[PDB]
């Protein structure tokens, strides 16, 4: 004996197993009705009394495999699968069943063939019993995990959010199977079906408050185990470097809720798995990590939420050191680039957007002297793009206000740091176009145009 205790200390597994163990099944009526064998019904009826009162031991488990495969009733296979799953996880009774099932793979394949059929409870009990033996060192099979993951019966219970116990048991079995490195390759193919329920399970708990005690997603035992298993399922699959790039590129929109989930929740299991999920994807061992770090920090603005989340600490200080190491790699990875090449490529691309390094005076200070190549052609090109967006591509729109507010806010730092920009701005024509943006809408961009007009008005007259 000595099997793992997966799906044994959870309240959802004992609550779902309590309904199966509470009801009784008449194996003698099914055997007299020509639905099961007499020896399998007598061994199945004696196995329930021998599992408690009883606890070559695996000799009685041989008739239950043929009786469950021959019979078609989900109640007898659910009760026999519940008694075999309860006797398999124990360390004092049914020790020969783990050695008999681990020694013979035909009984494991016959027990796995009965699962994923009929009700979702018998498929969850048979899949948890086959996943418990497959997760140990006695036997291993990736074809049973890939064939079980390809079936819609096992993924249908985990995809449904109405049952937190069935999705929590399937998420815990997928996390225990995903804990091994061989199962992550076959389990990584079907991550698109399990990723929306895992993201909606964290977004649903993050969308609701965690102060009052309720049956929903909260700070109770079920919500912390479901959110910890949901974050631990993506955290176990985030160890691969190739999976972190495609997971960060595909689930970039749903991955932004991990920073708000750690600040909203008080448990360290969601903040540690949320910080470890971004910290594992932000490593230098994954291919194309600079595109995911620059896309997450530039697009998602993960640097301000990571800087604000880095101040608030809690228990599990190793996750705080992982978030502190991820914040320095995230800010140091994007801040290490050249500001002149990024400003020249951003001005040449005709796309202005607000960034963390785009609103600092240190980036425009070093790029102010390097921008002068011919009569300040960089500031004349940026002012020519800002005024050219005002001439063609008319204003009072959503698209022109971002580039107009970015160019007007960026022109204030260059006009304030360099007093010689008034000649290039007045010669190019941005001074007359800068005053027209204040009278219109976009009062944030009108405030940036009021700041650039105040900076030009400060140097125009003292």
């Amino acid at each position: 004996m000595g099997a793992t205790k997966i799906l044994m200390d959870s309240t959802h597994f004992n609550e779902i197993r309590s309904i199966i163990r509470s009801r009784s099944v008449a194996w003698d009526a099914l055997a007299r009705s020509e639905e099961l064998s007499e020896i399998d019904a007598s061994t199945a009826k004696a196995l329930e009394s021998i599992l408690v009162k009883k606890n070559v031991n695996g000799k009685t488990l041989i008739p239950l495999i043929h009786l469950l495969s021959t019979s078609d009733n989900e109640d007898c296979k659910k009760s026999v699968q519940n008694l075999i799953a309860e006797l398999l996880s124990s360390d004092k009774y049914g020790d020969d069943t783990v050695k008999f099932f681990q020694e013979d793979p035909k009984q494991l394949e016959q027990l796995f063939d009965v699962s994923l059929k009929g009700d979702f409870q018998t498929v969850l009990i048979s899949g948890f019993n086959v996943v418990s033996l497959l997760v140990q060192n006695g036997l291993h099979n990736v074809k049973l995990v890939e064939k079980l993951l390809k079936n819609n019966n096992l993924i249908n219970i985990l995809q449904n959010i109405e049952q937190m116990d069935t999705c929590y048991v399937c998420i815990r079995l997928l996390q225990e199977l995903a804990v091994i490195p061989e199962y992550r390759d076959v389990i990584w193919l079907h991550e698109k079906k399990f990723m929306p329920t895992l993201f909606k399970i964290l977004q649903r708990a993050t969308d609701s408050q965690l102060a009052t005690r309720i049956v929903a997603t909260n700070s109770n035992h079920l919500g912390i185990q479901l959110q910890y298993h949901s974050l631990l399922l993506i955290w176990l699959l985030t160890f691969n470097p190739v999976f972190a790039n495609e997971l960060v590129q595909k689930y970039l929109s749903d991955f932004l809720d991990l920073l708000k989930l750690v600040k909203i929740t008080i448990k360290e299991k969601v903040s540690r798995l949320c910080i470890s999920i971004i910290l594992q994807c932000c490593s230098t061992r994954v291919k194309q990590h600079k595109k995911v770090i620059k896309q997450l920090l530039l697009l998602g603005n993960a640097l301000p939420t990571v800087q604000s989340l880095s101040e608030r600490k809690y228990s599990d200080e190793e996750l705080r050191q992982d978030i502190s190491n991820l914040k320095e790699i995230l800010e140091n990875e994007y801040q290490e680039l050249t500001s002149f090449d990024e400003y020249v490529a951003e001005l040449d691309s005709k796309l202005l957007c607000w960034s963390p390094p785009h609103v600092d005076n240190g980036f425009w200070s070093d790029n102010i002297d390097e921008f002068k190549k011919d009569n300040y052609k960089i500031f004349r090109q940026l002012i020519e793009l800002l005024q050219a967006k005002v001439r063609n591509g008319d204003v009072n729109a959503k698209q022109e206000k971002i580039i107009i507010q970015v160019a007007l806010n960026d022109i204030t730092h260059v006009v304030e740091l360099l007093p010689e920009s008034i000649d290039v701005l007045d010669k190019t024509g941005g001074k007359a176009d800068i005053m027209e943006l204040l009278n219109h809408s976009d009062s944030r961009v009108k405030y940036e145009a009021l700041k650039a007009t105040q900076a030009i008005i400060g140097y125009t007259f003292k």
Binding site: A211, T212, R213, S315
Partner: protein, 37 residues
């Protein structure tokens, strides 16, 4: 329904627990700061 937290010395826990419980407080359990995680 709402989580309440109070702090005081261990000499008036019965008087503060009776006055706090007499105004609608229920499920009052005295603990410390080193007994939790």
């Amino acid at each position: 329904m709402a989580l309440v937290q109070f702090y005081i010395p261990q000499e008036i826990s019965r008087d503060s627990a009776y006055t706090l419980g007499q105004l609608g407080l229920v499920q009052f359990r005295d603990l410390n700061s080193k007994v939790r995680a």
